Design a protein around this ligand. Structure first.
Ligand SMILES: [Zn+2]
Ligand SMILES: [Zn+2]
Length: 70
């Protein structure tokens, strides 16, 4: 932890987000919400379509050294 910290009674495990009122924190957690089921493994790319992700895999992560064949 580079940046100092006051010492809030509650904090977020996902990010360095902390609040005074517990209930408040929970509300913040919402920030880590997602509507698109299909998510990428390489990057944080999420699409509400099965094809959008497929083509995206190669679109960006296509000319990469993944499989040990070729
Ligand atoms: Zn957070
Ligand atoms: Zn990706």
């Amino acid at each position: 932890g580079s940046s100092g910290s006051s010492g809030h009674p509650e904090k977020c495990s996902e990010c360095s987000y902390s609040c005074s009122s517990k209930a408040a924190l929970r509300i913040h957690e919402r920030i880590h919400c997602t509507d698109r089921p299909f998510k990428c493994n390489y990057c944080s790319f999420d699409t509400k379509q099965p094809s959008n992700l497929s083509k995206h895999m190669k679109k960006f992560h296509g000319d990469m050294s993944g499989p040990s064949s070729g």
